[PDB]
């Protein structure tokens, strides 16, 4: 099964920078969302969930087809809460109806990371909407109540190795869990992209507690939390080494996250030899906007 990137007709870097800017401007404007966290973290989560359905074995799922717009995927229990991100992007799509859904969802994640002072994430256009019957079934996104072996095996389906997994999980520095969405509660409620996930893992005093949904999670007296799958990154000795590396090198984390996140968002897509090079968008701050 082959998905060939097809550039939206006649569009170039400047068109996509305009879409980026519209997303970024709305991120700045709609600041009250989720007790003043803003929409950044949920947009990152959305970009990950639309990509994380991919299966390397048959090239089903993935960001290309924009299938999150269809009920089956929209209503995946694993996607509870992401409707907020979709609603945020609706007026963007209305203004720029020419962008494909997969391009919009993935660009939303890139824009959020960058606007939250994260690394630059190169981004490529050309995802093409595919029909409702191409929507992957529910159950391809990961469970949070599992151990390191589960995480490692799960991510093999996405063609991610240990370093890539540990780098991607650093996104859990952003936002928070919500009991009604996932059965977990708490989080740093941060909207600035840093390597603090790793510092928190290594430096906090963690206690295994049950939350009000009767699920186990690790809590610190400082008020942070970790999912069992997060905590597994310090229980497994291979993951632990990488956690220590990223806790001790902000730049290395940024560079590795950028590569892994672009890869995640591009899995399943064949880029023609003459496709445009990846775009690196300027932030609003860099543009003086
Ligand atoms: C084993 C892998 C993973 C598991 C089990 C997992 C699980 C979860 C859960 C349960 C939540 C809370 C949802 C809610 O209650 O609203 C969450 C939130 C979040 N996840 Fe993950 N996740 C994983 C990997 C990732 C990856 C790879 C990324 C991105 C690179 C990511 C980005 C986020 C973000 C940004 C949030 C916060 C969303 C918000 O504040 O609304 N996650 N994750
Ligand atoms: N450390 C940590 N694990 C999960 C979270 C929240 C969902 C963002 N924070």
All domains of the chain in start order, with CATH: 1-141+261-289 (1.10.520.10), 142-260 (1.10.420.10)
Q: Which residues of 137-150 are buried (b: 16+ CB within 10 A; e: fewer)?
A: eeebbbebeeebee
Cβ neighbors of 45 (< 8 A, separation 6 or more) are: 81, 82, 85, 171, 175
CA distance linking residue 88 with residue 277, whole number of Å = 28
Cβ neighbors of 251 (< 8 A, separation 6 or more) are: none
Cβ neighbors of 11 (< 8 A, separation 6 or more) are: 98, 125
Q: What are phi and psi of 3, to 5 degrees?
A: -120, 105
Alpha carbon 18 to its chain's center: 21
CA distance linking residue 41 with residue 147, whole number of Å = 24
Q: Ligand 2 centre and the CA of 151: distance in Å?
A: 15
Resolution for the entry shown, Å? 1.2
CA distance linking residue 151 with residue 164, whole number of Å = 12
Q: Experimental method used, please?
A: X-ray
Ligand lying nearest the CA atom of residue 213: 1
> Can you name the residues that pair with 102 across neighbouring β-strands?
none
Cβ of 42 closer than 6 Å to ligand 2, yes or no, is no
The position carrying tokens 């906090």 is 204
Cβ of 230 closer than 6 Å to ligand 2, yes or no, is yes
Question: 277 with 221: CB under 8 angstroms?
Answer: no
Q: Which helix (H) or strand (E) holds 210?
A: strand 206-210
Closest CA to 44 of 140, 120, 109: 109
Q: Ligand 1 centre and the CA of 219: distance in Å?
A: 16
Cβ–Cβ contacts within 10 Å for residue 273, how many? 4
Q: How far is CA 252 from CA 42, 119, 259, in A?
A: 24, 10, 11
């Amino acid at each position: 099964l082959v998905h060939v990137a097809s550039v939206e007709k006649g569009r170039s870097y400047e068109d996509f920078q305009k879409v980026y800017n519209a997303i970024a401007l709305k991120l700045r404007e709609d600041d009250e969302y989720d007790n003043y966290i803003g929409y950044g973290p949920v947009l990152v989560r959305l970009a990950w969930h639309i990509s994380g359905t991919w299966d390397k074995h048959d090239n089903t799922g993935g960001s290309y087809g924009g299938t999150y717009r269809f009920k089956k995927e929209f209503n995946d229990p694993s996607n509870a809460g992401l409707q907020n991100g979709f609603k945020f992007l609706e007026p963007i799509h209305k203004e720029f109806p020419w962008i494909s859904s997969g391009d919009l969802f993935s660009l939303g994640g890139v824009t959020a990371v960058q606007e939250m002072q994260g690394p630059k994430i190169p981004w490529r256009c050309g995802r093409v909407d595919t029909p409702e019957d191409t929507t992957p079934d529910n159950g391809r996104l990961p469970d949070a109540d599992k151990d390191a072996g589960y995480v490692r095996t799960f991510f093999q389906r996405l063609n991610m190795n240990d370093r890539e997994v540990v780098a991607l999980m650093g996104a859990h520095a952003l936002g928070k869990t919500h009991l009604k969405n996932s059965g977990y509660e708490g989080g740093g409620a941060n909207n600035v992209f840093t390597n603090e996930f790793y510092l928190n893992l290594l430096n906090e005093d963690w206690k295994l507690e049950k939350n009000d949904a009767n699920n186990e999670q690790w809590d610190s007296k400082s008020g942070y939390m970790m999912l069992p799958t997060d905590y597994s990154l310090i229980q497994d000795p291979k993951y632990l080494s990488i956690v220590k590396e990223y806790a001790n090198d902000q730049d290395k984390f940024f560079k590795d996250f950028s590569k892994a996140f672009e890869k995640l968002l591009e899995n399943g897509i064949t880029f023609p030899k003459d496709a445009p090079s990846p775009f690196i968008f300027k932030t609003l701050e860099e543009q003086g906007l």
